[PDB]
Design a protein around this nucleic acid. Structure first.
Ligand SMILES: [Mg+2]
Ligand SMILES: [Mg+2]
Lengths: 48, 48, 48
RNA sequence: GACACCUGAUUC
DNA sequence: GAATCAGGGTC
């Protein structure tokens, strides 16, 4: 799966929940979502 | 299949997306809302 | 659907619904309650 | 079920 | 500020 963080410490797409969570855990109002394709993860990122 | 029943909020009723329901219950005192899988169940919550 | 343990409240004990638990702790000074997976854990909290 | 976070109620 | 509960991305 591809982890999209559109809002967090460090935005971008990540390949693991482990790295994804470092950006969003304890970060107020973090916006993230996992996807099956890189293309979708990136679309999410760019929607802000 | 996402139905958000707003029993207590800016506007009461059933909504199809969380963003919609959120705008009626966020920062609203004693807001009462719940998400259901079927429109029917959402109305019950709203009319009870 | 868990077990609501009320250590301090109008009536203490273990309740099965938030409503019943709520009726005992809401606006009760110094109310102490928590939900547990089992009844045993719950009655454990009631006696501390 | 758990974790994080948002909002609300109550209590301290 | 904190806790408990209620309603609403990830594991
Ligand atoms: Mg990565
Ligand atoms: Mg709508």
């Amino acid at each position: 799966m591809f982890y999209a963080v559109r809002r967090g410490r460090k935005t971008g797409v990540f390949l693991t929940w482990n790295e994804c969570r470092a950006q969003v855990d304890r970060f107020p109002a973090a916006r993230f979502k996992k996807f099956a394709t890189e293309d979708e993860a990136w679309a999410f990122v760019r929607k802000s």
